[PDB]
Amino acid sequence: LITGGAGNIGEVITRRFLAEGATVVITGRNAEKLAVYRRRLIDEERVAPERVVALRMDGSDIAQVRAGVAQIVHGGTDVPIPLHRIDILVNNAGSAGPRRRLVDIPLEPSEVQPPDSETLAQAVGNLVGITWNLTRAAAPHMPSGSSVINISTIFSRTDYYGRIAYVAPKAALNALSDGLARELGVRGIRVNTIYPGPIESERIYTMFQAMDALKGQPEGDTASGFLRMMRLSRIDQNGEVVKRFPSPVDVANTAVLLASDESAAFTGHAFEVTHGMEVPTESRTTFVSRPGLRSVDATGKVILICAGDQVDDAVALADTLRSCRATVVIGFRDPRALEKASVLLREPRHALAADMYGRPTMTAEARLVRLDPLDPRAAAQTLEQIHAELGAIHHAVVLPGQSRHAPSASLIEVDDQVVERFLHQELVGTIALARELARFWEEYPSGSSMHRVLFVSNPDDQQGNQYSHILRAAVEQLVRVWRHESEYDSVNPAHQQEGQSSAAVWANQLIRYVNNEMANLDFTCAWVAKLLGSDRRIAEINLYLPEEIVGTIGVHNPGFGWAESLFGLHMGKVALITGGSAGIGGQIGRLLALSGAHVMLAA
Amino acid sequence: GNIGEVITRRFLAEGATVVITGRNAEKLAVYRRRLIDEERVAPERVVALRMDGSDIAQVRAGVAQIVHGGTDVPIPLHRIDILVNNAGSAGPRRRLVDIPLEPSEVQPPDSETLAQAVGNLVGITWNLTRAAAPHMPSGSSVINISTIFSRTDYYGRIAYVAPKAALNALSDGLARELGVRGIRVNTIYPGPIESERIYTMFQAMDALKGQPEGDTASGFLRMMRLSRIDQNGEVVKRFPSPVDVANTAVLLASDESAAFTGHAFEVTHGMEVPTESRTTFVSRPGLRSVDATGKVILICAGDQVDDAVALADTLRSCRATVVIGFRDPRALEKASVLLREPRHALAADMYGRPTMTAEARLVRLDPLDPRAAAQTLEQIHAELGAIHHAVVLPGQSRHAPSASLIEVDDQVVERFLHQELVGTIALARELARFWEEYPSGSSMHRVLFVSNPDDQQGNQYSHILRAAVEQLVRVWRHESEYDSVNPAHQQEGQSSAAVWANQLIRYVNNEMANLDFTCAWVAKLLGSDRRIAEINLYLPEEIVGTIGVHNPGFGWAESLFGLHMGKVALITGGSAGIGGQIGRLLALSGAHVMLAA
């Protein structure tokens, strides 16, 4: 019925489902010691024992009980009800996690504080891993026309200061439901993705007072910002333009219908119970044009290309960045990839020169360092060592760790090894790398220009690109929060850099798993170079690229700044060329035709 | 139809009241009643009224008052009522070039003229919305059923998509406005019935398209999920069901789901389709590759003298002749006086060099009035030849003096819905016929649909026109491309060409360069070979904010970009004269300069 049956919204919903049935399988807490007597007396009120199953099932984060049914398929606590199939299942997590900035998130258990609950890996698990493993558990079971219900925060699209550990895994259940609807609907199972809104009470009020005290703004700033966002006015206790926040009664009212037969039509339905809100649920901008790269001037800057295992595109991306006449430091996650990349880069065509326009440049040779977000202290020491070697680090392209995740696209019948590799190494790994970058930005001296961190995604796998999909969707909210919450910190008296001056961060994420051409690699790197080396600020988080090689506009840019400078010079002027079939004449005719004139080649 | 029957059947009980209203042909209640009362329940709750077909504001208000007062039996008291907007007609099934503008063109399939087709279930819905302004009890609800094809490319039903669209924009504006009182409008998408009529209709469409049988239905059976239980396993794509969507919609209308306001009711069983095909301008286009030497651009202008003349200047800067047609009278002479001045009477290209391009002609066009616009189209044909580039601007600058939608009582919105939506549809066919009646082998046909600018209080009407345009462009582009290969229509004269249209929304940017950015985007999608795969285009909320570029015809400085990059230069006496200009162009090139004087 409801995963969060222990002191959770679902534990409250247990008061329902009894008028037309009975509330059963109320999952208990992890401790399971005081949970046996917890809410047992409350549940016994106005409800006979009957077959109501209030067993304190262990909501384990890891899959040690995944094979175990515990009222799923067979066995059970005391009755054979696991043999029966329950028509509903809820993927609620109910773990807020730590509430801190991007400099001091508790990555390891030694870094935890009493205000903190769990660690970074635990925090990511408590919101993604339980969802995924409970989805896999008892997959062939449940009725042929059952229902699957999710619950996520409505802040998964709105900015949320100091809650990256909350939203970064909370921006992943929606993506996973999106990717799983297509591959699950076959058997005839729907995924009702319903988001109950914040409940109006004194707790959220005090939360917001603490919130705007932390950000450093006058009282009621966040309250005004989230009240003006409201477009509808409630009719509770009549009145006019009350504009009260959403109530849990409406949450129960919109949740109970999933058990009824009327829900059979819905599938993949965004069902945000927040009433009358306008947010751009998805932020994107398909590239209409092809960027001009001969106005970047990235010289005098260091670009740490944090590549995990996909160094194949990295070496080329590093060379393209070198073409901007910029020094680069290529960082590697896997150990053996370092040797292969060194061998590949030693050969010319990768370490040749900083070839830009129609001319070369020495610039600096591409360095080679080993990094790993799994170990915090080693990665921080390596970053400090790079600081001592060169100085500050501002431009940092961030690529995922492993290339082409998993051998198969299926996400139902899979062993947990690859899935647990995807978590704790791509989500947690990238969050850890962002943590180290933010530590370097804050606790170490930097400049005044804004800080750029691109988040290029995995390429096309000729299949369902869900493994790049989760990466993109979990990166979107992360970069959005990192962008918005790092502006108040640059002016507040709390964080004045110990009297020094610093800058905020602006971070997009390119998406290239939608094109399937051969020039898409040059296209993405071009966009990467333009977003790093130039001055520009796009207000959209995610950036999408066209569905064709050239897409809307047909341009190829093989270092042809001259042909770009010669555009439209002699427009609409017929030209006659004698002997223009070999030598200087052919070249003059070709450059004139590229200019725009009309040419008549005679030989 | 069937969904209305099921809704009325569910009304028979559960503490509900049934009202079979909205009679057709001004008298249909007698033809459609007394069958709901045939059930044991509701001995008197069954109510039928012979309301006017057009349902103007005053007659709608009278009908509402007589319903509140009942059939003289109950005390007069306004209360809740049925506000579902399911009442409507399909309209003509005419093809992409032929259209019933005048009533004389009535056909057995086309029982309604263009204006009547537009008002079938759009104008009447808006008028009923206005007539339900004064007294709607708190906690009520109202929906506007739209078709699921309001985003999917269609064929032969431009009159069932262009007016069937913009209901979303009207609902958006009404949700923003009327939400203060505590009322809601949510778009609802009941799917096609799994009946034999819809099955044979698909077969007819396949035959009409000139394609092998089954591919049109394959487009629905391929990119649509199943996620159903019917027939136990192996539930093949059978399209959504009407009874389920009707029952769920009326359950939303009842309690247990109050104040949802998070429902689009897009019941297509998956069917991944964007809610709006659009992109953002994160870069400024480079107008250097634009070429229109041998091309004629006719600007379908209106009373907007300033904007149309600016567009004419920015297109004539691409060495092209123009024909500026103005919709309303008494504006031709002002345009002539303004254009007489040398500011707009001289054409200079993007480098700042004057060009001896043909001057700006001036004609008079009357979209809403057929047989005269076509005559003028043929006249300008005889004058110049075929015309392919048609920038279509709206009728009036500000569609209403007050930025509101429900306070009015059908006085100016009639002019809007009759001369700026229908007007556009009439002009679109006027142009389509010129292109198809006279086939011309060339590139695809380009029809931009620039929207009006923003001054204050946003642009609710612009939103409406945008929603109607996106679909008109989408459905058209599809039909055109499909009909470019059919030998049936190919034999008419010579070989023709397809059409590719777009939109260039501007009502979101409020700056000083939004009337120059718009000129750049109109001149880039016409004078170049760039096929946007997305329908609606949108300006950035901040021009200098995302990409600040200033282009007063300065293509030289654009050509001199990144030449001497990362070099330090020392200049002597570089404060005024030749050396100052060398320093200026070198700094624009990318080098580092050190001015000393």
Residue numbers in the entry:
A (entry chain B): 13 to 615
B (entry chain A): 19 to 615
Sentences from the paper on this structure:
Malonyl-CoA reductase (MCR) is a NADPH-dependent bi-functional enzyme that performs alcohol dehydrogenase and aldehyde dehydrogenase (CoA-acylating) activities in the N- and C-terminal fragments, respectively. It catalyzes the two-step reduction of malonyl-CoA to 3-hydroxypropionate (3-HP), a key reaction in the autotrophic CO2 fixation cycles of Chloroflexaceae green non-sulfur bacteria and the archaea Crenarchaeota. In contrast, green non-sulfur bacteria, including members of the genera Chloroflexus and Roseiflexus, employ a single bi-functional MCR to catalyze both reduction reactions of malonyl-CoA. Full-length RfxMCR was a homodimer of two cross-interlocked subunits, each containing four tandemly arranged short-chain dehydrogenase/reductase (SDR) domains.
For the first time, we here determined the cryo-electron microscopy (EM) structure of the full-length MCR from Roseiflexus castenholzii (RfxMCR), which shares 58% sequence identity with CfxMCR, at 3.35 Å resolution. To investigate the dimer structure, RfxMCR was imaged on a 300 kV Titan Krios cryo-EM with a K3 Summit direct electron detector (Gatan) in counting mode. From 4,647 micrographs, 4,043,667 particles were selected and used to construct an electron potential map with an average resolution of 3.35 Å. The overall structure of RfxMCR was a homodimer of two cross-interlocked subunits with the N- and C-terminal ends assembled in the same direction; the dimensions were 160 × 110 × 95 Å. The ED (Gly783–Arg932), which comprised eight α-helices, was inserted into the SDR3 domains (Gly573–Glu782 and Met933–Gly962) and was exposed at the two sides of the homodimer. From the full-length RfxMCR structure, we first resolved the conformation of RfxMCR-N and RfxMCR-C connecting region, which was folded into an α-helix (G573WAESL578). In the center of the homodimer, two of these α-helices were anti-parallel arranged in the reverse direction. Instead, it plays an important role in connecting the RfxMCR-N and RfxMCR-C fragments and also serves as a point of intersection for the two subunits to form a dimer. Actually, the dimer interface was formed by symmetrically distributed hydrogen bonding interactions between amino acid residues from the RfxMCR-N (SDR1–SDR2) and RfxMCR-C (SDR3–ED–SDR4) of the two subunits. We did not resolve any densities of substrate or cofactor from the cryo-EM maps of full-length RfxMCR incubated with NADP+ or malonyl-CoA.
